[PDB]
Amino acid sequence: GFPTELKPGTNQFLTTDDGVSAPILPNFHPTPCIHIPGEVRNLLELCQVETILEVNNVPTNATSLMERLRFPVSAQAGKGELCAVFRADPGRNGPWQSTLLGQLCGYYTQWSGSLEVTFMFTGSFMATGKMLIAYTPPGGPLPKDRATAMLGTHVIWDFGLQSSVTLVIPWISNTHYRAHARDGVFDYYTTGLVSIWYQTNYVVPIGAPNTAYIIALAAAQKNFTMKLCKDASDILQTGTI
Amino acid sequence: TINYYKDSYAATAGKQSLKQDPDKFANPVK
Amino acid sequence: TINYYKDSYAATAGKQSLKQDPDKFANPVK
Amino acid sequence: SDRVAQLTIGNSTITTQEAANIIVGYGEWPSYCSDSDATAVDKPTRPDVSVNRFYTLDTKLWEKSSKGWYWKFPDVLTETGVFGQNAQFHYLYRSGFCIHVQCNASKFHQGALLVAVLPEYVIGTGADGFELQHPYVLDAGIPISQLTVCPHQWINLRTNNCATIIVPYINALPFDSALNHCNFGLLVVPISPLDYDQGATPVIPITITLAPMCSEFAGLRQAV
Amino acid sequence: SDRVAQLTIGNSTITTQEAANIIVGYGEWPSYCSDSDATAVDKPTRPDVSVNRFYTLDTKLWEKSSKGWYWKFPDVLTETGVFGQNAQFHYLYRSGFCIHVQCNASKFHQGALLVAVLPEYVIGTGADGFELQHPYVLDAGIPISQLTVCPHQWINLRTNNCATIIVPYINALPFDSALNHCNFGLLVVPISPLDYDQGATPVIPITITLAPMCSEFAGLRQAV
Amino acid sequence: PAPTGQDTQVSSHRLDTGKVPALQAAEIGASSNASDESMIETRCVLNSHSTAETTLDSFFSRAGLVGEIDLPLKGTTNPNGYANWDIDITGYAQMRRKVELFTYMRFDAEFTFVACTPTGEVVPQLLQYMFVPPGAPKPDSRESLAWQTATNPSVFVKLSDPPAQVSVPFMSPASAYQWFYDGYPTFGEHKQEKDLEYGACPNNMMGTFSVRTVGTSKSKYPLVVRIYMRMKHVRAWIPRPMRNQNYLFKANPNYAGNSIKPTGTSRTAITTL
Amino acid sequence: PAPTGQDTQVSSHRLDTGKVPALQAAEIGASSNASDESMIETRCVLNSHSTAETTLDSFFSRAGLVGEIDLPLKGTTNPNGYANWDIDITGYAQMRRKVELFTYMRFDAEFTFVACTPTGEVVPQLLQYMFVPPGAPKPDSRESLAWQTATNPSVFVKLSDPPAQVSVPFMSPASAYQWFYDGYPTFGEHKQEKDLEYGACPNNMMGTFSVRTVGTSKSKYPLVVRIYMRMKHVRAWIPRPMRNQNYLFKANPNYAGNSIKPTGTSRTAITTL
Ligand SMILES: CCCCCCCCCCCCC/C=C\[C@H](O)[C@H](N)CO
Ligand SMILES: CCCCCCCCCCCCC/C=C\[C@H](O)[C@H](N)CO
């Protein structure tokens, strides 16, 4: 018949290949598909939904595992005290590991885009105060005081009727994409740091609680993209199931 | 899609259509 | 039907035509 | 303008003066089964006014050390009202739901709740609801921090005192039985614990109200 | 052509091969309450298929010395089916009725029945019916010979074996309660006594079947 | 449409009262809407990054292990040269965690079977893979009469040949597969025994997989078969939060209650990295 | 035409005398005509279920076992390395029950031969399958002169190669094959001996199948050959009731008279499930 030749790529089973195979059921018609609400057409559609961030990931015991979702705030001596810090690296293990964005990003090697962190105040109605949230780009170490942190991009948050403010972390980088950061050589892709400072005080009249809590929600902007699919770093089994 | 048989479910995956509706889950407010 | 030879009986089964005459066996009444 | 609200359906009415708008689940209002989706051959019954109204279920107390509660739908209403009677007299059932959660306190209290709806809530190891044992993992091995991906709202005691969610019919079949399948479960978890100083009122009840919308039944038989 | 008959409504069907046509009570088919007749302000519920179907009540035996039986409407159905459940969950009620009486025997039996409907049957001195004590005066001081002025039919064992009557809503009010007022009563009296010779089957049961038509309910409350 | 990421428009400083993009009310339940060009001073950037790698087909059309069958010479599992395996996907964690992100899926499949000796060596031997739909006669031995495969699909292949593969349609009576089923499959009273059927969805039981070595007497080599699965024409609905703790049983969300662990890593203090 | 199932039209209640869809007279011999929309109250349903899987081609175009040949080293069946097998389909129950639903069939065929050792191992060996039409010289040994296959079709193949397959036309002198023949094939007197030819239809005897191992001396391995058959371009006529009892002999409807069994299962009482 027709003379052919075989190239040195035959008989190999490649997992990611797209190929044609012989069907097992000739002339088969599946069940019709009715309309079911809530269809996903892209993993990026649900990469922009805010989820609770675990900034206060100090405790570990079983009975206090719920305390990791908020961090406390109270009255001080008005000297610009520090509240909490963390690293703004979605793929690196840390506070971001508790969000849907953090879990999904583990399936993709490289990402690019702007993030967004929202803080909500859950105190009494008569408690007022202001806070400063600062984002230090790469190169600068952790700020030692407020007057050093105010140099980078920052936003001043005022308590009031509107109880939520959003700090947008703009995409500032040297490369078009960033790989996942880790300790050692791969610190080249570190995004920076986030700090929260007392602005004036936490003022409260008589007969009202002295301690309040803040809840932080994180998500991604409209230019967030990921590529180069890989497998996750965590396996949820310890043998046969 | 490339197909060599009489059944449509034996073809390749092909290229989908790039459409997004982020407002379905992020902004469901009336 | 797909054929590669000179004989029609070596081809594939192909797709038939969907026709039914249920009245031949169920309602044969004159 | 989205601070006062009135919701009326059937012969019941709900008013609130501190609202947080209305969340429509997955951006789709409830509707009836179209002629192309149907599979039954018998004409269904639509009682309309007699089963689409607000029902009040039970009251649960909020304490400084509470864990959380969850309910199941439509298991709660099978012994309540004409909706209950029709559910046991018919085999196929479909409907939507409008859910309203009420919890109010003074200006000197503080705390926050997480109201969410999770379809097909399989629980690992009635109308009064149950109390969670391991709220961190939702009693099913999934973290609670990602619950916001589901239709949800918050009850912040300094901002509002109510939450409203509208959920259409969610299932892979046009009709299903109401006595063997629970489409979704409602969750109410205190994320920020309640706090107040001695002398204030220490009872902060939580009450649940809900109303079926666009109900349908088919397959009449004896009551089971 | 008026010898075979099939009546279907809802999800039940009745067939008979020896009929005596159909009597429409007072020459008016049942209908709904017009907008000018209504007095309520709340929209009523019309379950339609779930309450308009044939129900079988009970069986009574015909003996050579029987007196007669009578039933009351709609008192019989208040504990049966979705019609019963809706009756106790609502205050106002209206509907029509289609009534079918069955009694069959062989060719060697003889006897005749008088099936009639008498509105507002006040009795002088449930679903199983009662037995008359003085059938000549209808237990109310009126002669039975003039009963034919009411919608009626006959069951002659040599001609037919069934009787059909269609009765609209009869009352002076557009709506009324189903637990305190009985619109009409059905009467079945043997005028010509049953007779047969020894050796034939001596059991000649009588069974009653009926079906509400164009029902309506209003005034929802708790079940009473 | 969304073929690429969004651009960034030039912005300047703004000092005006009444319009506040920054302040929000997260109690409503909707994500933010403030953008980069509304809280800092930005430039013009023309984004041309493709978003075609994050589609459902691009994320699920990759092969993964779902099955394992052992045919030993001496042992207790399958010493007769035949095996029966019920079709389940929940047997392995990597694929299960991926597929459990959603609630309803509708897809075709492409199955690939790789066979070799336990040591990895390849020997000349013949087999027969038989697909047994629910309600069909299941074989009980190596020479069972049901192996005539008069109607059920079957495949004959040798070890020395490249691994065999077939294409599979969507065979569910429902409109989609569901990995979670909050209910029971029977109208019973659910006293205690039915609780072992909690979540057992009959719409997911697709059949049985049967394998044997074609022959009358016992073979001469121990054999192992590995089943790999790939998805195509995928649709998904209603995403749910991802898994946190370890898996214990197939088709069960059970977890070890005594050993509960946080989602991520931990540090010593909140004011120190 | 009937590409999909029928729909259902909206119906309402009817109370009128003279027209009775429900009552029937089955003594006539025709099936019913009352539909759903004429005995209960129905809604509008748009049916779109395909009926393409129930066609004759869709039901018969599946391979099945019909033959078995043994070529042992030591034994009494075929110790000379050659075998003769008359072409018959009635040798196995699964295919026979399927094909016996009808009386006349007309179809082509696709035959596939699978060969291996009795233990399932594959060894390098050469064979020759020869089709012997009726009236041709049948071989009697391994080195028979008739193996020159001057006119008869023949196939040379090795065990290590994929199984060989051929396409087969319709070779009957009649207009169709018949699995039942109520009569005798000769004009004789039918005293007793002819009764062994009762039902023997000459129109179904299509020939002989011959197999040998190409060589002069005896081979070194025992071999087994399996013949699989698949139908295409199928036409059928005059369906008949399906088989009930076990099979006893090829091309014979004989059954065990002492052990007669009901078609289905049995219960204790008629008023209890
Ligand atoms: C040569 C025959 C082999 C073909 C056998 C495979 C066909 C059937 C595969 C089913 C596809 C996956 C869907 C199955 C159901 C669910 O995954 C699980 N039961 C989860 O409960
Ligand atoms: C390479 C040569 C092999 C080809 C040999 C097969 C060709 C003939 C097959 C006949 C097809 C089936 C029809 C035969 C007749 C009936 O099935 C039986 N005799 C029933 O009595």
Q: What is the three-state SS of E52-110?
A: CCCEEEEEEEECCCCCCEEEEECHHHHHCHHHHHHHHHEEEEEEEEEEEEECCCCCCCE
* DSSP bridge partners of A135: A194
Two tokens, residue F57: 């087909």
Q: With 0-12 CB in 10 A as exposed, 13-18 as middle and 19+ as buried, what is G193?
A: exposed
Q: With 0-12 CB in 10 A as exposed, 13-18 as middle and 19+ as buried, what is G142?
A: middle
Distance CA A166, CA D116 (A): 22
Two tokens, residue F271: 């004011």
Residue of E nearest to D221 (CA): E81
Two tokens, residue F5: 């990421």
Give percent helix, percent strand, percent coil of chain D, each to the nearest 5: 15, 45, 45
Distance CA B18, CA A41 (A): 8
* DSSP bridge partners of E187: E70, E116
Alpha-helix residue ranges (DSSP H) falling in chain A: 100-105, 146-149
Q: Cβ(D188)–Cβ(D69) under 8 Å?
A: yes
CA E14 from centre of chain: 15
If we measure between CA atoms, which residue out of D116, B20, A234, D35 comes closest to residue F93?
Answer: A234
Distance CA F251, CA F241 (A): 17
Instruction: List the chains bordering chain E where 3 or more Cβ pairs fall under 8 Å.
Output: D, G
Q: Cβ(A133)–Cβ(A155) under 8 Å?
A: yes
Q: How many CB atoms lie within 10 A of CB A34?
A: 18
Instruction: List the chains bordering chain B where 3 or more Cβ pairs fall under 8 Å.
Output: A, C, D, F
Q: Indicate contact of D with B: 3+ CB pairs under 8 A.
A: yes
Two tokens, residue F186: 């029977």
Give the contacts of E134 (CB within 8 A, at least 6 positions apart): none
The residue of F145, F158, F175 whose CB has the most chain G CBs within 10 angstroms, and thus the best one to mutate to test that interface, is F158
User: Pairing between strand A108-112 and A115-121?
Assistant: unpaired
SS3 state of residue F262: coil
Give the contacts of F122 (CB within 8 A, at least 6 positions apart): F116, F159, F160
Write phi, then psi, for F26 (nearest 5 degrees). Answer: -70, -10
* DSSP bridge partners of F155: F129
Write phi, then psi, for F192 (nearest 5 degrees). Answer: -135, -40
Residue of F nearest to B19 (CA): F1
Q: Cβ(A95)–Cβ(F267) under 8 Å?
A: no
Two tokens, residue F94: 């990597």
Q: How many CB atoms lie within 10 A of CB A92?
A: 22
The one-character DSSP state at A125 is T
If we measure between CA atoms, which residue out of G70, G78, G68, G162 comes closest to residue F145?
Answer: G68
The CATH number covering residue A160 comes to: 2.60.120.20
Distance CA D62, CA D208 (A): 13
Two tokens, residue D219: 């397959």
DSSP letter string, F60-121? H-S-EEEEEEEE-SSSSS-TTSEEEEE--STTSHHHHHHHTTSSEEEEEEEEEEEEE-TTS-
What stretch of H or E contains G206? Answer: none
CA distances G231 to F99, G57, G94, G108, Å, are 40, 8, 14, 6
User: What residues of chain G, 37 to 96, have a C-beta less than 8 Å from chain E?
Assistant: 39-41
Two tokens, residue E133: 């004590």
Handedness of CA G187, G193, G195, G196 (dihedral sign): negative
Write phi, then psi, for A180 (nearest 5 degrees). Answer: -70, 130
Sheet holding A193-203, edge to edge: A82-87, A193-203, A128-136, A154-158
Number of independent structural domains in chain A: 1
Which residues approach ligand 2 with their CB closer than 6 A?
G 87-90, 109, 111, 129, 131, 153, 155, 166, 168, 177, 204, 206, 209, 251
CA E198 from centre of chain: 33
Broken C–N links (> 2.5 Å) in chain C, after residues: none
Q: Side chain identity at F202, as an amino acid letter? A: P
Q: Cβ(F223)–Cβ(F160) under 8 Å?
A: no
Experimental method: cryo-EM
CA F85 from centre of chain: 17
Q: What angle do CA G169, G174, G175 make, to 5 degrees?
A: 75
Distance CA A114, CA A168 (A): 7
Burial B3-27 (b: 16+ CB within 10 A, else e): eebebebbbbbeeeebebebebbbb
Q: What is the CA radius of gyration of chain B?
A: 17
User: Pairing between strand E55-62 and E204-220?
Assistant: antiparallel
Distance CA F127, CA E143 (A): 94
The one-character DSSP state at E221 is -
Q: What is the CA radius of gyration of chain G?
A: 27
Distance from the Cα of D201 to chain A's closest Cα (Å) equals 13
User: What residues of chain F, 151 to 170, have a C-beta less than 8 Å from chain A?
Assistant: 153, 162-163, 165-170
Give the contacts of D207 (CB within 8 A, at least 6 positions apart): D56, D57, D58, D59, D60, D101, D102, D103
Structure-token match 């008869």, residue found: G152
CA distances F49 to A112, F57, F200, F235, Å, are 9, 19, 44, 24
If we measure between CA atoms, which residue out of D80, D73, D31 comes closest to residue D213?
Answer: D31
**Domains present along chain E, CATH in parentheses:** 1-224 (2.60.120.20)
Write phi, then psi, for F113 (nearest 5 degrees). Answer: -110, 125
Q: How far apart are the first and last CA of chain F?
A: 41
Two tokens, residue G48: 């779109």
Distance CA A196, CA G184 (A): 104
Q: Cβ(A29)–Cβ(A18) under 8 Å?
A: no
Two tokens, residue F154: 């079957």
Exposure on the CB side of residue F51, measured as CA atoms within 13 A: 22
Q: How many CB atoms lie within 10 A of CB G50?
A: 15
Q: Cβ(D149)–Cβ(A45) under 8 Å?
A: no
Which parts of chain D are beta strand (E)? Answer: 5-9, 12-16, 23-24, 55-62, 69-73, 90-102, 110-119, 130-131, 152-156, 162-167, 184-195, 204-220
Two tokens, residue G97: 């029950």
Alpha-helix residue ranges (DSSP H) falling in G54-211: 56-60, 93-99
Q: Which atom of ligand 2 is nearest to the CA of G90?
A: 20
Two tokens, residue D42: 């018998």
* DSSP bridge partners of A166: A118
CA distances A133 to A162, A201, F38, G31, Å, are 17, 15, 17, 83
If we measure between CA atoms, which residue out of E202, E220, G62 comes closest to residue D53?
Answer: E220
Q: Indicate contact of E with A: 3+ CB pairs under 8 A.
A: no
Q: How many CB atoms lie within 10 A of CB F206?
A: 17
Write phi, then psi, for F89 (nearest 5 degrees). Answer: -100, -25
Two tokens, residue F143: 């020479």
Entry resolution in angstroms?
A: 3.5
Two tokens, residue G263: 């078609």
Distance CA E3, CA E161 (A): 11
Two tokens, residue G139: 């071989």
Q: How many CB atoms lie within 10 A of CB A198?
A: 21
What's the residue count for chain C?
Answer: 30
Residue G165 forms contact with C (CB below 8 Å): no
User: Pairing between strand D110-119 and D184-195?
Assistant: antiparallel
Cis peptide before F72 (omega within 30 of 0): no
Write phi, then psi, for F59 (nearest 5 degrees). Answer: -100, -25
If we measure between CA atoms, which residue out of E177, E37, E9, E185 comes closest to residue E94?
Answer: E177
Q: Cβ(D36)–Cβ(G4) under 8 Å?
A: no
Handedness of CA A118, A123, A128, A131 (dihedral sign): negative
What's the residue count for chain B?
Answer: 30
CA G90 from centre of chain: 7
Angle of helix D81-89 versus helix E81-89 axis, rounded to 10: 180
* DSSP bridge partners of G131: G209
Ligand 2 centroid – CA G207 distance (Å): 7
Distance CA E82, CA D222 (A): 10
Q: Which domain holds residue A191?
A: 1-241
Exposure on the CB side of residue D4, measured as CA atoms within 13 A: 1
CA distances D219 to D91, D161, D216, F197, Å, are 5, 41, 11, 25
Distance from the Cα of A51 to chain D's closest Cα (Å) equals 5
Q: How many CB atoms lie within 10 A of CB G183?
A: 9
Q: Cβ(D212)–Cβ(D29) under 8 Å?
A: no
Q: What angle do CA A152, A154, A159 make, to 5 degrees?
A: 155
Q: Side chain identity at A30, as an amino acid letter? A: P
Write phi, then psi, for B10 (nearest 5 degrees). Answer: -100, 10
If we measure between CA atoms, which residue out of D83, D76, D166, D84 comes closest to residue D117?
Answer: D166
Q: What is the largest CA-CA distance in chain B?
A: 49
CA distances D66 to D71, D191, G97, Å, are 16, 10, 68
CA distances E194 to E20, E61, F142, F224, Å, are 20, 12, 76, 85
In chain B, what residues touch F31 (CB-CB under 8 Å)? 26-27
User: Pairing between strand G64-71 and F104-116?
Assistant: unpaired
Ligand 1, residues F99, F180, F204: which to mutate, most atoms within 8 A of Cβ? F204
Structure-token match 């570190």, residue found: A190
